[PDB]
Amino acid sequence: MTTARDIMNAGVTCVGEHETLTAAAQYMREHDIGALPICGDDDRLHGMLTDRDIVIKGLAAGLDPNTATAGELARDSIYYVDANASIQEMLNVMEEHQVRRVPVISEHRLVGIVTEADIARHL
């Protein structure tokens, strides 16, 4: 049986929860990415932060990008699948949260990221 572990992009960097929104923006530019998994110490997943979140939940909400943190916003977007999750389970989570990307966890730690495109390649 195919699992998230089989399909995921293993070993991605999880940005620190205390990083400011400005630092997260710099990170998104530096690494040409728009969705970041945010973690507490030891890669403990706290949620996902997108470029749009910074604008909508950050700037649009009157938050200061130089003081508000990635963790404060990512906590509003917590969802994931276990490394042993099936393709159907991953699709169910994506559907429920209206996203095409989902973090993969194993023993409370982020171990990878799975996208619909990844699933598509493993059918």
Added chain:
Amino acid sequence: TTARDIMNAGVTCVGEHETLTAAAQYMREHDIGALPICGDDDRLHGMLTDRDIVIKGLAAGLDPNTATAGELAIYYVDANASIQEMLNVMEEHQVRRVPVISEHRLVGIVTEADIARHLP
């Protein structure tokens, strides 16, 4: 079918002198990821996306309460443009949103999804 038939007419246009924070608020308000930027009398100056604010704004060290949409700001179609013509512009600029102009003024916005839902 023309752009005028498919567009969301009279959508908000962020003024060139409005700040990035103001633009962000419009994006939340209308739940959209891109807004046309206008000079006087609805004259189109360009488009601003949410990622633009993050990458060309915050990542560049600019203050969103100071920097304006105009400073981060070209493509569009006439209101009589065909679907084929609209798709050409979207493919050339690699975008899913396009400003519609008529008599030198912005009159609306057309999205790729708009075209899809308007096809019989």
